[model samples]
Target: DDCGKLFSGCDTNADCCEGYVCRLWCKLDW
Candidate 1:
């Protein structure tokens, strides 16, 4: 499924969601 939350504007890291990723935005991976 498409993800992206937090600050949004992601590019990968599965697009975000879960614990978040996409360091270029969509943070909260900790």
Candidate 2:
């Protein structure tokens, strides 16, 4: 449907939700 969770990585190389960082899949950890 969409993509990975807020704090999770992309098994299928997808995008992160809730405006999160996909590099580490963290919520505003930058």
Candidate 3:
């Protein structure tokens, strides 16, 4: 779900997946 996973729906960075940041790109950048 879009709760604590990257590329998923998030309202803020806290909602992003582990080790992933919430950006407009909607994905993790490493």
Candidate 4:
């Protein structure tokens, strides 16, 4: 959790899945 995992809740891009970034306004992306 909070390890940048997909669909995981994040406060910043650093909290998204590997090779992916967090979209505070929506979901995560690569």
RMSD of each: 6.5, 3.0, 3.7, 4.3
Ranking by lDDT: 1, 2, 3, 4
Better of 1 and 4 by lDDT: 1
* Candidate 3 lDDT, 5-29, residue by residue in tens: 6566565644765666566534776
Best candidate (score: TM-score)? 2
* lDDT (Cα, tens digit) per residue for candidate 1, span 1-30: 766677686755556667866666776874
- The lDDT of each candidate is 0.68, 0.59, 0.59, 0.52
Clashing residue pairs found in predicted model 1 = none
In model 2, the worst 10-residue window by lDDT is 9-18
Backbone steric clashes in candidate 3, count: 0
Candidate 4 steric clashes: 2
Clashing pairs in 2: none
User: Which portions of model 3 show Cα errors greater than 4 Å?
Assistant: 1-3, 12-14
- Candidate 4 pairs with clashing backbones: 4-16, 4-17
- lDDT tens readout by residue for model 4, 1-30: 544555555646555546545554325453
- How far out, in Å, is residue 13 in model 1? 18
lDDT at position 27, candidate 2: 49
Clash tally, candidates in order: 0, 0, 0, 2
Backbone clash pairs for candidate 3 read none
